[PDB]
Design a protein around this ligand. Structure first.
Ligand SMILES: [Cl-]
Ligand SMILES: [Cl-]
Lengths: 254, 254
């Protein structure tokens, strides 16, 4: 079971992590990979992951929105030039969350989907959320720094480099989100999902989560849920997708 | 022996790689890591790596230079806004190789060394070579897309995300270069080198290298060389380092 990769990484941090300062235990440089074949959706079972949050927050970023009032009014907790902005309007001057950016900055997402369709074998289908000229971003920068899509044998795969991740909450959430982005984009482009590959720089556990994490990691994982994309109407762009287009089947977390 | 990680990755591509078009065999998503402790320098032994090239080309990028005439006149084969430019002048308008950029764009390298000194525990010591607004870059973009430094227990480590790498020539070269950057920066900042962690998106073998690669991978690796930093005068910035500051000991490739 691939959740073991997550649990082993947690065990590793608990047993051999460094102490650095809120304190943490940490290691540097880790990888986990999850198959998305046969509708597998790597939503962790050893502790319930906020699925509705994953979905709404991904669709929100894909709309390029930056106003957490949208999310709040959907049961999910101005944010600045966070992910969606960088994804969809890279290099634009960021003003306010209530403002318009159509035709400003580089739409890396549109560019990635186009490349997937015209040149699926491309090695340059990269999307970056890291802009060192954006001082606002740079004072509280994205944890998930960059990702790459790959098409091989009709399967869309994704690799994401995460500079820092908390194992307790953030990392499981992020596995879900990028897995869901791959599934969403696979559907949009007529492909089947392949794999999500997660690369981590700093991987840390918070001290106040130690006790709970060590109970969690003796639980045997359960088979991952399945995720089906069944749009309620036509979807020609990624911002068009709605929460309801996704049926989560067999999710049974401890 | 950590070179086995390289050889196993090659075997894996040979045996289970996809065929995509000059043809290649390829897999997506791989990791290798190399300890830089006790002066270990991961210069591959199963086939000689162009050490002089590694060094000169790293020092060249660290000077922010973009004119391959500098390299040519040092026995190593306008390049545009390649690595050094992005590293040292991110977001500046790139004009010519013969031109000056002091005070233009973000000096991510200087920013990274400063962070290493003031806030070694930082999780945001990231350097990106990926600028999707730079159409010139984007027509022939960097393979080594981003890297992160980490300081833990007095040891500098580095992780680099490479979007595409040829196993034959490019990947061994790149392992050397980032390992050497870590050693160089470790010395400059008073730290000891830790580890180089290599994350790869597309990892490919060229068809015309298949036969040679399969002979190569039956050779038992030899212990890696050691690398010592012994500057011939004072070094207060990374662009100051010279080829001669580095003594390579015990390099014996097949
Ligand atoms: Cl945690
Ligand atoms: Cl090759």
């Amino acid at each position: 079971h691939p959740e073991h990769q997550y649990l082993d990484l947690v065990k590793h941090i608990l047993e051999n992590g460094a102490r650095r300062m809120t304190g943490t235990l940490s290691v540097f440089g880790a990888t986990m990979r999850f198959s998305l074949e046969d509708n597998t959706f790597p939503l962790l079972t050893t502790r319930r992951v906020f699925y509705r949050g994953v979905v709404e927050e991904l669709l929100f970023f894909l709309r390029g929105e930056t106003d957490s009032k949208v999310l709040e009014k959907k049961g999910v907790r101005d944010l600045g030039p966070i992910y969606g902005f960088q994804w969809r309007h890279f290099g634009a001057r960021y003003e306010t969350s209530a403002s318009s950016y159509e035709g400003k900055g580089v739409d890396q997402i549109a560019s990635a989907i186009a490349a997937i369709r015209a040149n699926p074998a491309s090695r340059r289908i990269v999307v970056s959320a890291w802009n060192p000229t954006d001082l606002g971003s740079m004072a509280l920068p994205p944890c998930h720094v960059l990702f790459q899509f790959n098409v091989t044998d009709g399967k869309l795969s994704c690799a994401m480099y995460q500079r820092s991740g908390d194992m307790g909450l953030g990392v499981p959430f992020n596995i879900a989100s990028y897995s869901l982005l791959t599934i969403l984009v696979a559907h949009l482009t007529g492909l089947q999902p392949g794999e999500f590959v997660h690369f981590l720089g700093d991987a840390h556990v918070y001290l106040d989560h130690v006790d709970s994490l060590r109970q969690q990691i003796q639980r045997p994982p359960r088979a991952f849920p399945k995720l089906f994309v069944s749009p309620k109407g036509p979807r020609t762009e990624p911002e068009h997708f709605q929460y309801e287009d996704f049926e989560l089947v067999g999710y049974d977390p401890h």
